[PDB]
Structure 1
């Protein structure tokens, strides 16, 4: 509260660390469904069903241009990729499996990087 400062984590390396995580994501063999925005002209349903599309190229651009206020906003966009993937794709399909794999990959890096 006013004039009562809470201790806060050192956030100075967050940008570099999130960039590194995103690079690891981008180069994963199963990243292929997530590299570019879902093609709204070619993918019937997508536009209407998925209210907030997100993908790794969009996140990279946002990260490179100061559009994440903090590391949590970054993680929210990463998780949004995988949440959209699950909404739109069967768990059993190649894309749905890829999404599950990439979510797991991401969360382990997230915990290992930012949870002490």
Structure 2
């Protein structure tokens, strides 16, 4: 409350550390469905169904230009990528499997870097 704060957790390295995580997600062999925005002209249904499209290149641009206020808003966009994937793709598909694998990979790096 006013003039009453918990001890200040050091967030000075968060930007660099999210960048590192995103580099590792970019370079994963199963990243290919997530590297670029889904082409809304060429994929029937996507535009209407997926209200908030997100991909790794869009996160990278947001990160590089100070559009993440804190590390939680960064995690929310990464999770959005996988939530969108699960919304549009069957689990038993190459893309559906890729999304599950990448979400696991991310959540471990997230816990190990910050928790």
TM-score by length of 2: 0.99
Structure 1 unaligned runs (5+)?
A: none
Q: Secondary structure at the match of 1:53?
A: coil
Structure 2 unaligned runs (5+)?
A: none
TM superposition shift of 1:8: 2.9
| Equivalences, count | 115
TM-score by length of 1: 0.98
4+ long deviations beyond 2 Å:
none
Q: Distance in 2 between matches of 1:8 and 1:75?
A: 21
Question: 1:26-52: per-residue Cα shift (whole Å, max 9, x none)?
Answer: 000000000000010110000000000
Q: Distance in 1 between matches of 2:69 and 2:7?
A: 19
CA root-mean-square deviation: 0.5
Q: Distance in 1 between matches of 2:57 and 2:109?
A: 19
TM superposition shift of 1:6: 1.5
Corresponding position: 1:25 with 2:18: no
